[PDB]
């Protein structure tokens, strides 16, 4: 029952928690002699927000070229306006009878079925995110790959203009994200890779500078520049590679 | 189509979830 994001969890806790303050009150089947007073109006305003939801919901399915996307939200559509009949069926039955056992059943089932659905859409959406760090993750991956090639200090001053910049962003989306997660061990996990990628960057810079400046020379120190090279890209691409495999863990709970 | 993204309509929804409840709660 624990939320993958801060952001899922304080739009979604509430809710589970009135849900199951309710499920205290009313099991399965159960009668009790208090009259529920009409529900009509909130049951409408629930219906107007599952709606809006699903119109948002679909001008993405209609718009996005993530085929993912286009697979999962369209089932979370259904889940949610299924629910709200329930809680529209269920405001009508105690309208006539404020003591009625199956609305009270209805109530409890539509509302799960609204958090269950809304938790699919948001978790889907969350995944969408993912990827699109993964991307700017394996955009640094590939760029890495072209240090092997500087081979001049004009070409290696363009590098380091490109990269620099580039790194800083991917640093400042992995923050963001660590700080959106609620597993601790995951967010450490991230931080201390992110971290040890920041310390690598000079090293890989002054490691290319002594390569370019020692390159055709025969007393040269070019052997172990070029291992050093190697060597940097080669711990800054696996910690790169840990960051996209933490990115897209999930604990077992739920 | 920018005017409402999907977290503001997923909070709206969880606002109304959220006083439909509480509106059952007081009775």
Same mark, same amino acid.
């Given at each position: 029952?624990?939320?993958?994001?801060?952001?899922?969890?304080?739009?979604?806790?509430?809710?589970?928690?009135?849900?199951?303050?309710?499920?205290?009150?009313?099991?399965?089947?159960?009668?009790?002699?208090?009259?529920?007073?009409?529900?009509?109006? @909130?049951?409408?305003?629930?219906?107007?927000?599952?709606?809006?939801?699903?119109?948002?919901?679909?001008?993405?399915?209609?718009?996005?070229?993530?085929?993912?996307?286009?697979?999962?939200?369209?089932?979370?559509?259904?889940?949610?306006?299924?629910?709200?009949?329930?809680?529209?069926?269920?405001?009508?039955?105690?309208?006539?009878? @404020?003591?009625?056992?199956?609305?009270?059943?209805?109530?409890?089932?539509?509302?799960?079925?609204?958090?269950?659905?809304?938790?699919?859409?948001?978790?889907?959406?969350?995944?969408?995110?993912?990827?699109?760090?993964?991307?700017?993750?394996?955009?640094?991956?590939?760029?890495?790959?072209?240090?092997?090639?500087?081979?001049?200090?004009?070409?290696?001053?363009?590098?380091?203009?490109?990269?620099?910049?580039?790194?800083?962003?991917?640093?400042?989306?992995?923050?963001?994200?660590?700080?959106?997660?609620?597993?601790?061990?995951?967010?450490?996990?991230?931080?201390?890779?992110?971290?040890?990628?920041?310390?690598?960057?000079?090293?890989?810079?002054?490691?290319?500078?002594?390569?370019?400046?020692?390159?055709?020379?025969?007393?040269?120190?070019?052997?172990?520049?070029?291992?050093?090279?190697?060597?940097?890209?080669?711990?800054?691409?696996?910690?790169?590679?840990?960051?996209?495999?933490?990115?897209?863990?999930?604990?077992?709970?739920? | 189509?920018?005017?409402?993204?999907?977290?503001?309509?997923?909070?709206?929804?969880?606002?109304?979830?959220?006083?439909?409840?509480?509106?059952?709660?007081?009775?």
């Amino acid at each position: 029952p624990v939320f993958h994001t801060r952001t899922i969890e304080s739009i979604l806790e509430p809710v589970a928690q009135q849900i199951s303050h309710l499920v205290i009150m009313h099991e399965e089947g159960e009668v009790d002699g208090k009259a529920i007073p009409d529900l009509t109006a @909130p049951v409408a305003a629930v219906q107007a927000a599952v709606s809006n939801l699903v119109r948002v919901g679909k001008e993405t399915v209609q718009t996005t070229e993530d085929q993912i996307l286009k697979r999962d939200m369209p089932p979370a559509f259904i889940k949610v306006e299924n629910a709200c009949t329930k809680l529209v069926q269920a405001a009508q039955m105690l309208q006539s009878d @404020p003591y009625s056992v199956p609305a009270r059943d209805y109530l409890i089932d539509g509302s799960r079925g609204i958090l269950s659905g809304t938790s699919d859409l948001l978790l889907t959406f969350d995944e969408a995110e993912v990827r699109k760090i993964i991307r700017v993750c394996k955009g640094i991956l590939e760029y890495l790959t072209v240090a092997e090639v500087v081979e001049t200090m004009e070409d290696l001053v363009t590098y380091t203009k490109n990269l620099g910049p580039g790194m800083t962003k991917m640093a400042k989306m992995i923050d963001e994200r660590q700080q959106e997660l609620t597993h601790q061990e995951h967010r450490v996990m991230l931080v201390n890779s992110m971290n040890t990628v920041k310390e690598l960057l000079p090293v890989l810079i002054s490691a290319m500078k002594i390569f370019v400046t020692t390159k055709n020379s025969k007393n040269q120190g070019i052997e172990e520049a070029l291992k050093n090279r190697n060597f940097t890209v080669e711990k800054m691409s696996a910690e790169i590679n840990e960051i996209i495999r933490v990115l897209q863990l999930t604990s077992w709970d739920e | 189509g920018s005017h409402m993204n999907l977290l503001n309509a997923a909070t709206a929804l969880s606002g109304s979830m959220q006083y439909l409840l509480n509106y059952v709660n007081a009775g």
